[PDB]
Ligand binder design. Structure first.
Ligand SMILES: [Ca+2]
Ligand SMILES: [Ca+2]
Ligand SMILES: [Ca+2]
Lengths: 141, 79
């Protein structure tokens, strides 16, 4: 069990046919709280692949650094004076997913991996977070 | 003397908050720089620890980017 999280990510839900590409837009509800940075890694159920992570975090109008080799992304979400930003309702992350044409009918998850850090300030303090949805239904299981 | 490479906020770990404090010091030095008025301004020790890119040139945007690269395993260490 975990308490009601400070910040909630929503990966969305999707339906696809085997062979299709899926754009996964992740939004965030910070409950009107400002966030200074994020540092995360993603994960996805085999045999689906995250092919690319967009370098824009539209929710913060900021640029993310990425490393597809670890499905990682991070950014600092500060205004031009250094103050942490409250995200908009736009996607915080965009993932470009391939559903191979060999994929069996089923429901496949996309979400975070073993690291998802949402920072409050400049001192290592972090919000609690959770993620919802991220179900990709492939065919008619 | 550096206590921990990348530890710009002197909390004993290297994480994305270290990139934040560098960016804040650069964006608003009167608030967040070495002589800043905010309680969480960067410290002298933090500026030494944070000088991970081109060590010797002090704190620039590229120091924050280097911390991000390290966190992403794009580079193996800091410096
Ligand atoms: Ca969940
Ligand atoms: Ca630190
Ligand atoms: Ca430097």
């Amino acid at each position: 069990p975990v308490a009601n999280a400070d910040v909630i990510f929503d990966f969305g839900n999707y339906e696809a046919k085997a062979g299709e590409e899926v754009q996964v837009d992740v939004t965030v509800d910070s409950k009107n709280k400002a966030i200074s940075a994020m540092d995360v890694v993603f994960a996805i159920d085999s045999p689906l692949t995250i092919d690319e992570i967009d370098k824009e975090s539209l929710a913060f109008k900021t640029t993310a650094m990425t490393n597809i080799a670890i499905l990682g992304a991070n950014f600092k979400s500060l205004d031009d004076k250094g103050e942490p930003l409250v995200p908009t309702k736009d996607p915080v992350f965009t993932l470009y997913v391939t559903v191979p044409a060999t994929t069996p009918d089923g429901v496949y998850n996309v979400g975070f991996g073993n690291k998802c850090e949402v920072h409050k300030s400049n001192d290592g303090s972090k919000y609690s977070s959770t993620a919802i949805n991220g179900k990709i239904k492939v065919g008619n299981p | 003397n550096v206590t921990l490479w990348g530890d710009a906020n002197c909390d004993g770990i290297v994480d994305i908050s270290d990139a934040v404090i560098i960016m804040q010091s650069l964006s608003n030095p009167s608030k967040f720089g070495r002589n800043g008025n905010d309680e969480h301004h960067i410290t002298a020790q933090g500026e030494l620890n944070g000088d991970v890119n081109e060590n010797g040139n002090g704190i620039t945007n590229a120091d924050a980017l280097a911390i991000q690269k390290y966190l992403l395993n794009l580079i193996g260490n800091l410096t």
